Every structure is written in structure tokens, then in C-alpha cells.
Ligand binder design. Structure first.
Ligand code: ZN
Lengths: 233, 236, 232, 239
């Protein structure tokens, strides 16, 4: 019960730091405007650092889509999943509110809200988000799969570079979400809810798809005591 | 029986995601045109992520030239090699067709097709493509070698950074191929086939060269007794 | 012991040489070169790969702190004597100023400029800036503490690259506010060399409070030592 | 003898091929400036990922020095014989010139230019430049020695990435002063091909002195090997 509180607090603090660093590096700085690689790197090294710092404490999900993928995959409970999602949404909004406070009003702008970009339709955008989140979930699962042992070698860096990879494509379409908490945080703070469902449906469907594809298509477990049913039939 | 189907599906899905992410990061030019480092990084982190995610399930070739190189020192049969190459070509075209569908019409353009750049001749270009794939094949062979030292595990980041390295040079000459499936995918979707043989001959010759150089010249592997007999009995 | 004695001298010398090289490379890459002005990613990468290279090269010799704020975090956290902490902080401040003085004498006079001093940027107030510096150093210590946690013995992990990328991460945000410090020695070094002490306390209070916060958060809240025989 | 063994021939060939590929990729990414001029980070990354890839591919075969300064650092630090050191240096210089000559052949005449030769930049004096080159090669050699240190536990690939990022780090500073050498073979290769030898001694004295300094500092001052079989047990009793 104490260990669970430490895990929920870690999930809160991780999303707080991720959103604070992520959005802050993505803001329109007039003296030196951030590049697609620079932003991809900020979110990428953000996740990679927090997985390194907090992975052994909570699993370092830092994303409700990842927690949901984990609910379908990891032997996690619906109780832990709810407490994690709630901690991530609270941590994210706290990170976006904290950043607002420390950033001068002139720069703040859209506070790096997820917005449909380059005349992309919501239907085209929801499809990108699905694939952006699918590849992250595939990588996260492979990097943390206990059956693999110490073989992944670089889980934090791999997971981090997967977030960066998502951003190198995603930025052009939606500003890149892959995370419902990262989307809700600046949307709640700076009132902007433009096609918000895309940043929820996309990541969540992509995460569930990736979780089902990994755990039951690509690398499923061996047959359980359900084989006794096939013997009885 | 199931394991082989899972491996072929992984090879298909890996090339689908690689081509989708790779090309998509190389086109997308509004009031933010992608840089050589940005593109190198997209293809590089693309392969690295996919080797990490799918290596343990298929070997994560994601390249017909890599599968061909592996036909000499990866314990890949001609049957598996054919099924992998077919899965990669199908996955790649599916990734390029999917990207076309999701990208607004005006941005699409060439769809990041491999094309001769900065007035480079096809002969000069095919030589670049040979060396770009030779170093990649050299890195994959060492990275998957039990004798390379370290602890068990595949360095997915090392392989990824080899792809990025290839792009830092290759972009200027051909838009960097190193992968015949990555070349065919936007060529089939768009209809552009200008100097298409360079993107097949270059990676394939470079891969076979790197495979022969590693396995016969540089670090000849330890033969099992059955393999050794395939050589001995397969003489006089 | 004699063996134990040489080891401490090697550690203090490594901390000196590490801060010398870090400040020399870091500031030098951040200078306003006219032919090619450095980008936020380029600078983040210079300081990032700087710490990562030094952690790789010197970690097994001193712990590769290269920062008085992290040295202070090991005092409250990874419980070390006040003697080593003082010798490390003194070595880092000496190494840093030596690195900044060496760089000054290596760069032509025209391009030296402000010598990459930490300065309040984009009209950020000192109070807003000290809050940024707190959070930049907090994430760094959290990452350092986990990468070097005694309990993380077995699998080596990637401490040098991870720590390196955590410094780069802090720069991708921090550059816009203060030019990014996260390190009181990196701030003092060009300030002593080129007399520019504008809002200097921010670059001391920010990193130090952030480091102590991260050390207390890791050792008392997040991952404390086991209180009893329950799990030891 | 060492000379008449297959393994030694493979190591010398590996050192030749590594310098060939390094110089070919490195210079080519630094000179290619038509309607897309390369940035300091882009070039740093090309040379950086170049060394990292080659250390990964060839490290287990020859030690992947790809640099006469590194070979010299290893000579001073008792890792290689004077015979192997000579054969490595000769292979690196031959490989480098072959890599620059090959690149010249494949690059259109309009973009070749000075072929990314090391040249004193931003009005830096040769004395200031030789001091930079010393510190660039010193940190590199410090990283190489730790990355190939049997006493240090690491995960697969990470030592080659660390050496690679050390080369990039050097370039992020060095580019502004000399175009960043850290390697006498990388300097000689386009100088022989293009015919430009302006302040060439800096690119030899700088890296060689920096490498010897780093080798002596690591092996004698910072982290020397054990002297006795009882040394590690003598440390253990301090609990
Ligand atoms: Zn050596």
C-alpha cells in the first residue's frame, strides 16, 4: 500500500516534468524558433530521462494510452490503471500550469497545444496518431518484456528515441500527441479544444492495437490451463 | 509453423512502419523544410526502434539488401529469405500507400522518391549506394555476432545510427536508398522510376560485399561440424 | 590505507579535470560564431555529450559529478562525508575557472564576447528563472540517483548516455530562460573570467535547491532504504 | 611471430578499411554544400556516428583505432607492440588517402572544393589551434580508454556510441577553430588529394600530443592497472 502510493506519486511527478519540459521547448521563441528535430529531441530525451529515473518505481508510463495498453497487456489491475491515468492527467495539467506561471506572457502563445496542422483532416490526423502510438507501444513492450531478460540493453534510450521518431512525423500533422495527458494539459490551461477527440481516440486505439498485436499476435504467451478445455472437448 | 508466420508478419509490419515514418518525415515541408540531419535521424531512429521492437521476433531486417547479405552468415534459409523480401516489398508499398492517403495532396509531391541529386551520375551514385550499404551490413554483422564481446543482446541503437550515418552522406547523392524496398514503395505509388536500377544494384552489391568481407576476410565465424562437412564433403 | 589515500587524490583530480573539460567544451560551443551561429539543439548537444563523455571517461574514478549542486545532492542523498564533498566542490570551481580562462586564451578576442555567461533571457524575471533552474537540476539529480543507485548493481544500464541526455534535455528548455546553468561551477567560471555577475544568485539558489529537492524526493519519498527486515 | 599470423593481417586490413570508410563518409558530409549547407551539428554527427559505427563493426577485429593518434596513445599505454603500431599507422594513412581519392571520384567537380581539408578558421592562430587540437584528442582518448576498459561494465553497443559521441563533442567545438581534425590521417587524406597543406603541423602535433597526454593521464594518474594479485583484496578490507 505504501509502494503503490510511491508508484502513483512517481506517475504524477513524471507527467508533471514531461509536460513542463516538452511544451516549454516547443513554444514559439522569437529569438530562436524551435526546429522539428529540436522538439522531437525535447519530448524524446524527456521520456528517456523519466523512464531512467522512475521506471523502477512505477514502470514510468507517463501516458494514459500506455497505461491502457498496459491494462490489456501487463498483469496490472484496473485499480492501478485508474490511479495511474488520474495521476498522469493531474501531473500533466500541473506541469502546464507551472510552465504558464514561469514563461513570460509574450512567448506563452498557444502553450504548445495539439492542433491540426498543414490542412490535415481530423480523419487523416486520427490515423497518424494511431500509427505514432502503435510503434511506441511495440517498442515499450519489447523493451520491458521480462521474457527478454537483460537483452533490450537500452530500454530508456530506445523508448525515448521512439517518442522522438513519433514527433519527427507527427509534428507536421497534429503537433504530435501520442499522449492524451500531454494534449489535455495545455488545452485545459490555455482554452483550446480544436478536434480534441483526435488526440484521445488516436493514441488510445493505437495503444490497444499495439498491445493486442504484441501480446497476442507477434509474441503471445504459451497456452495456459485453458488447454485442459481442448482435452475435455 | 506459427513462429515463421509471426516472423514474416513482423518483417511486413516493420517495413510498413519504416517506410510510413521515413518518407513522411522527408516530405512534410510547410514553413518548416526538413534538414539532412532531421531526415537522417528519422530513418535512423526508425530502424533502431523497429530492431528493438521486432528483432527478437524476425531478426528485424526491414531491408531486402540486409536479408540478401544474411543469406551468407545469419542462418537464414533461401525459403525464409524469399518470404522476408516479399514481406518487405509488400509492407513498404503498403506504408507508402497509407502515407499518401493521410498526407494532404499539396504536400505529397515526389513522396520522398530516391532520385539522383546535385548532378551526380548514375555510375557515381551506384558507387555511393554500395558503400552506404557495405558499412550498414558490416555494423549488423558485428552487432549480431556472439564473439563481438559484451553481454547477450542486440544494439538496436548502433544499427539505427549506421542508417543515420548513411543518410548524412547519401541524401546529397540519391536521397539515400540503402534499402531496395524503401526505393520501390514511393516509385510504385507515385509512378517515378528515374534511375531505379541504382537503388537496387547499389544496396545489393554493397550488402553482398560487406557479407563476404565480414564472413570470409575479416572475422570468419566458427563452423559447426555439420557446416564444416558441407565444405569438406562438398569437395572431391 | 595508502591505496585508499591515492584513490581520493585521483577522484579530486578527476573532478577538477572533468569540470575543466566540461566548461572549456560547453562554453566554447555556445559562443556567438559569426559564420555559423549555434542553435539551441547544437548547444544542448554540446553540454549533453560533454557530461556523457566525462561520465564515461571519469565515472569509475570520481563518480563524475562535474557539478557542485550534484555534489551537494550526494551529501543529503548518497551519504558521503563533508570532507569529500568540500574537496569535490573546491576542485569543480577551480577546474571550471581554469577551463574558462583556457578557452579565453584559445579564442580570438572578437568572438569571445560575453564568453557564454548565464544571463536572464527573453525578459524572464529572476523569480521565474530560479523556478526553472530548480526543475532543470531536479530532473538531472533524479536521473543521476537512479543511474548510479547501489541497488542497480547487476545490469550496468547506460548511465553516461542517460546522464548526458538529461543535461541536453535541461538545455532544450533552460537556454530560453537563463542560457541554462543546472551547475553553479559552469555559471561562476565565465562570470569570474569576464566580469558579468548579472543575477548570479539565480544560478546558485536554483541548481542547489533543485538538487536538494531531487535528493530528498528520491531518498525519502520515491525510493528510500528499507526501514526493516520486511524486504531489507 | 605476430606479423605472420592471419589475425594480424585481418587487423591491419580492418584498420585500412575503417579509415577508408571514415574519411569517405566524414569529408563527404562536410563538403556537400549545394542548396543545403551542412550545419556544425550535422558535421559533428557525421564524424561522430562514423567512428561509433566503425568501432561497433571493427572493434573486436583490430581495436578500431581509425586514428594514428589513438594508435600512438595505445602504444604508450601498453596495448599494442611497436610493430603493430607502425602497421596500423601505415594502414590508416593509406586507407584515409584511398577514402578521399574515392570520394573525389564520386563527387561532382562543382561541390568538391577544398574537399573538407583541415584549415585554421575564424582568425585562430596556429598556437591557439594546436592547444584546441590537444584538448579535443585528450578527451577522446580518455573516453576510448574507459570504453575499452575490462574493469567497466557496459551494455552492448554503448561503448561504441560513447566513443562516437566523444568525436561529435570534439567537432562541436573544434569545427570553429580548425574544422576539427583529432586525427592526423583525416587531415593528410584531403591535403594529399587536393594539394592544400596550410598549417598541416597543427593537425599532427595537436592530436599526437593530446593523445599521449590522455594515455599517460589515464594509465598512470587516473585509473592505473593493479600491481599485485592482493591489490583488490587489500581494498575490500576497507569496510
Ligand atoms: Zn588500447
Amino acid at each position: 500500500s505504501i509502494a503503490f502510493s510511491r508508484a502513483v506519486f512517481a506517475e504524477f511527478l513524471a507527467t508533471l516534468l514531461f509536460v513542463f519540459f516538452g511544451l516549454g521547448s516547443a513554444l514559439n521563441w522569437p529569438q530562436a524558433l524551435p526546429s522539428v528535430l529540436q522538439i522531437a529531441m525535447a519530448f524524446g530525451l524527456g521520456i528517456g530521462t523519466l523512464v531512467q529515473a522512475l521506471g523502477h518505481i512505477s514502470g514510468a508510463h507517463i501516458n494514459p494510452a500506455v497505461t491502457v495498453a498496459c491494462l490489456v497487456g501487463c498483469h496490472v489491475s484496473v485499480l492501478r490503471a485508474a490511479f495511474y491515468v488520474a495521476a498522469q492527467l493531474l501531473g500533466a495539467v500541473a506541469g502546464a500550469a507551472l510552465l504558464h506561471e514561469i514563461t513570460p506572457a509574450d512567448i506563452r502563445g498557444d502553450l504548445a497545444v495539439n492542433a491540426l496542422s498543414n490542412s490535415t483532416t481530423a480523419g487523416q490526423a486520427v490515423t497518424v496518431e494511431l500509427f505514432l502510438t502503435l510503434q511506441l507501444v511495440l517498442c515499450i513492450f519489447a523493451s520491458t518484456d521480462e521474457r527478454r531478460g537483460e537483452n533490450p540493453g537500452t530500454p530508456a534510450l530506445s523508448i525515448g528515441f521512439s517518442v522522438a521518431l513519433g514527433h519527427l512525423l507527427g509534428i507536421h500533422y497534429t503537433g504530435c500527441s501520442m499522449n492524451p495527458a500531454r494534449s489535455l494539459a495545455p488545452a485545459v490551461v490555455t482554452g483550446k479544444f480544436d478536434d480534441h477527440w483526435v488526440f484521445w481516440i488516436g493514441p488510445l486505439v493505437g495503444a490497444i492495437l499495439g498491445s493486442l498485436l504484441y501480446n497476442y499476435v507477434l509474441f503471445p504467451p504459451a497456452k495456459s490451463l485453458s488447454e485442459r478445455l481442448a482435452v475435455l472437448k
